[PDB]
Enzyme design. Structure first.
Site, mmCIF file in Angstrom:
data_model
loop_
_atom_site.group_PDB
_atom_site.id
_atom_site.type_symbol
_atom_site.label_atom_id
_atom_site.label_comp_id
_atom_site.label_asym_id
_atom_site.label_seq_id
_atom_site.Cartn_x
_atom_site.Cartn_y
_atom_site.Cartn_z
ATOM 1 N N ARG A 100 0.881 -1.150 0.000
ATOM 2 C CA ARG A 100 0.000 0.000 0.000
ATOM 3 C C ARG A 100 0.930 1.214 0.000
ATOM 4 O O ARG A 100 1.670 1.419 0.954
ATOM 5 C CB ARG A 100 -0.931 0.049 1.221
ATOM 6 N N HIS A 159 -6.846 1.952 -7.242
ATOM 7 C CA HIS A 159 -7.217 1.143 -6.104
ATOM 8 C C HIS A 159 -7.956 -0.106 -6.544
ATOM 9 O O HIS A 159 -9.071 -0.335 -6.169
ATOM 10 C CB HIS A 159 -8.006 1.976 -5.097
ATOM 11 N N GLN A 183 -10.135 -2.816 -4.508
ATOM 12 C CA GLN A 183 -11.418 -2.258 -4.100
ATOM 13 C C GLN A 183 -12.488 -2.387 -5.212
ATOM 14 O O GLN A 183 -13.643 -2.777 -4.997
ATOM 15 C CB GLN A 183 -11.237 -0.794 -3.663
ATOM 16 N N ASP A 220 -17.293 8.392 -2.687
ATOM 17 C CA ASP A 220 -16.082 8.261 -1.872
ATOM 18 C C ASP A 220 -15.743 9.572 -1.192
ATOM 19 O O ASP A 220 -16.224 10.654 -1.586
ATOM 20 C CB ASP A 220 -14.911 7.835 -2.760
ATOM 21 N N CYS A 259 -16.456 2.930 -0.327
ATOM 22 C CA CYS A 259 -15.298 2.055 0.044
ATOM 23 C C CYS A 259 -14.941 2.203 1.490
ATOM 24 O O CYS A 259 -14.369 1.303 2.075
ATOM 25 C CB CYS A 259 -14.036 2.281 -0.781
ATOM 26 N N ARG A 295 -14.306 -7.688 -0.078
ATOM 27 C CA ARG A 295 -12.881 -7.621 -0.443
ATOM 28 C C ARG A 295 -12.045 -8.878 -0.120
ATOM 29 O O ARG A 295 -11.048 -9.165 -0.755
ATOM 30 C CB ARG A 295 -12.200 -6.473 0.304
#
Lengths: 301, 305, 303
Positions: free
Chosen positions: B98, B125, B128, B221, B261, B289
């Site tokens: 990450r 991302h 996701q 988001d 998310c 996920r």
């Protein structure tokens, strides 16, 4: 019951058999420590080390517990003997990476579990074991002897190489600056050991002399963690390992560095990358050696 | 050649869809397909939600995770990334990372013997979006292999990855962000090209309500995108009309699902009422996920040469 | 669906059966939670606690996830109900060590997974369970009753010992300084429970009175974590309260000293006396393992 705090406590035969076992395990992995547990106590974080240990026990069938600096404040909250008497009673092994060797000793003193020195200011034995494994892999052990040069500080790495050379019977030349000294107590131990094993040891302040007729060159960072500097660098003027330096050693000699490396200082970019393969196998090889070490300590309770 | 998972851009419609289907199989019937395999997780900035997904993904699959944190692992601050890569990538089977900067992923992948997985970068991302997709399929909002999707928010990583994935899959997607905001031309171009092949109906605007028309899936988001937190006060004012609230959802089709998310900032990009109205889906999204990372890791295990 | 937030929520029978099970497991370990997962959320790190839980689930056949303070910022970023509704839905159990009890309650309220109170400002039940296990191991439980003295602050440990003694029917004397008070709400619960169980509970400000006719002495740090902004004053208040040789002399012959740790030699306890009891104090420490094991198996069956 035996701990693994320094190679000083082991025989030529014991050390060599650790390297041979490592080699067997690398070839044919086996889960010899099913369900066994290893507490890993870091006073100062080292990702490279942690990997080696965590994977060592894991692959052997056990579990690792990572207790970090933030997590575990040693000698800063509770006393060490207390910590030892709890942790050392609940797990099968304890590895520790410490600022000060006394801390390892004090812990070991009160630990029911064998304690493993992942690094202290005096000794860095796991690293030397790996270096050794690597020398053997690169067929630079002609006649059970190795012709080794160590260039750098009078640091832990130096101590451990001095010792191990002495036990094993190696021919070793050590080079560090003029003002730098080696511990008389350690030096004495090595002198005694060389007599028994036939070690050809020499200590100096001339890079090029140390390098003559060598198959294995070992170097290390000069600015050691915590000890951070500007003055020290200038003291290590002639000491970088570069093309001309490696030229002085035997043909096809390997360069070992425990890492991390600081290109442009203890080692040149060109020469370092020239030896990437061996330097990074070196890094990885610590795994097989810690495995051996752990199986070994499991049988010496 | 060995494949990493840094962005969905590198995958085919068929590949992405099969990851979702596999996820689904695994959710139905869990199997330990990666016995003894190891996953290094390197965080430059901590995300507990992400870590859980990965840790449990490999664990349940029969393997082991190594959590190397920010404190633990200082990337590009001490040793160079190629050095780290040539150690860590040699000892583990997979490496998830990450990162603050995508380049870091690329540079690591470049030197890693192990497949590297982009758990989150400023550009993309993808794990996701895979989970969002899984969720859309579970909520039967993928009528005809197509989905009619609205994305409302910043021109951030999530936007990029939705734009891209829409583009690959052939979805009908409307994006809405403020007037001053732009999408990266390089990314946008890729999407234009991909839409041609796949028949994607992609549209970008600055009108929440237009984007929302005839949509079964509304995605939003946070506006203050992570790291960019030194600039927040200003961004908020710019996103005035953009919250998802009851009236906004009203504009979308009946029974349309709201995806986020997380974490969510009630009173900003989403209202409390509406967020809680969709708790079931939003939190399944969160959890889903796991299954998707499972698929991904099986998939990368099979594509090593 | 039952959580484990305080022993207040359990019966004499339930508590005793946790201790018995622990004991069976210590004797004959079994992997009763194959593949099960435990999320461990720390708001303030405790290595001792972590070991206990990590090894408990691990030995039981499961896996632990350590989410630390740095890793997980609770009630400081996202709301707790959101966290609960993600974490609590992916794992089988959630232990939490928290600054504030309300946080456990709020989490439990939204957690599909049973939550375990690894320590809060109000209660420290896993520790009391371990203490109990230990008392039984050192044969200081004559007739299912124990004669116990607690010396220290009106802290979490005190609350939990008070409560548990009340439920179990123990004879307990508590000693703390004059200015110090127990939470009336907790105290009232204990009074009620003693009636049912026949607990002999007494609270005073005299160390020596508390100690009279006791087989178990329990003490704890005075400077309780967090309250460290007020320390200099607290120490002076606890003048007479150290456990030393003369203090232990007042208690019955062969009486055991328990301390949850860490200890501050020279304060709540003298070096001499602490070391005199190293064996029991450190078994105490270790014994938390067997008890967390019991607890976890128990919560697995009460879904």
């Amino acid at each position: 019951m035996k701990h693994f705090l320094t190679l000083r406590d082991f025989s030529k035969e014991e050390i060599l058999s650790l390297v041979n076992h490592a080699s067997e395990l690398k070839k044919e992995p086996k889960k010899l420590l099913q369900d066994k547990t290893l507490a890993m106590i870091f006073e100062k974080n080292s990702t490279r080390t942690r990997m080696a240990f965590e994977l060592a026990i894991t692959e052997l069938g056990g579990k690792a517990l990572f207790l970090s600096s933030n997590d575990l404040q040693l000698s800063r909250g509770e006393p060490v003997k207390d910590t030892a008497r709890v942790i050392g009673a609940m797990v099968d092994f304890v590895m520790m990476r410490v600022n000060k060797h006394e801390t390892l000793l004090e812990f070991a003193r009160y630990s029911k579990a064998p304690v493993i020195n992942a690094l202290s200011e005096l000794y860095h034995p796991t690293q030397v074991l790996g270096d050794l494994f690597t020398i053997k892999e690169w067929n630079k052990m002609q006649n059970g002897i190795a012709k080794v040069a160590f260039i750098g500080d009078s640091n832990n790495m130096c101590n451990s190489w001095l010792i191990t050379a002495a036990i094993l019977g190696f021919e070793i030349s050590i080079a560090m600056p003029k003002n730098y000294k080696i511990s008389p107590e350690i030096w004495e131990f090595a002198m005694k050991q060389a007599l028994i094993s036939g070690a050809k040891i020499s200590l100096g302040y001339d890079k090029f002399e140390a390098l003559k007729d060598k198959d294995v060159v070992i170097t290390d960072t000069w600015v050691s963690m915590g000890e951070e500097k500007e003055r020290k660098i200038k003291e290590f003027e002639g000491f970088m390992i570069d093309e001309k330096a490696m030229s002085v050693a035997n043909k096809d000699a390997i360069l070992l560095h425990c890492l991390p490396a600081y290109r442009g200082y203890e080692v040149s970019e060109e020469i370092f990358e020239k030896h990437a393969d061996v330097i990074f196998e070196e890094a990885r090889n610590r795994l097989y050696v810690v495995k051996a070490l752990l199986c070994f300590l499991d049988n010496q309770r």
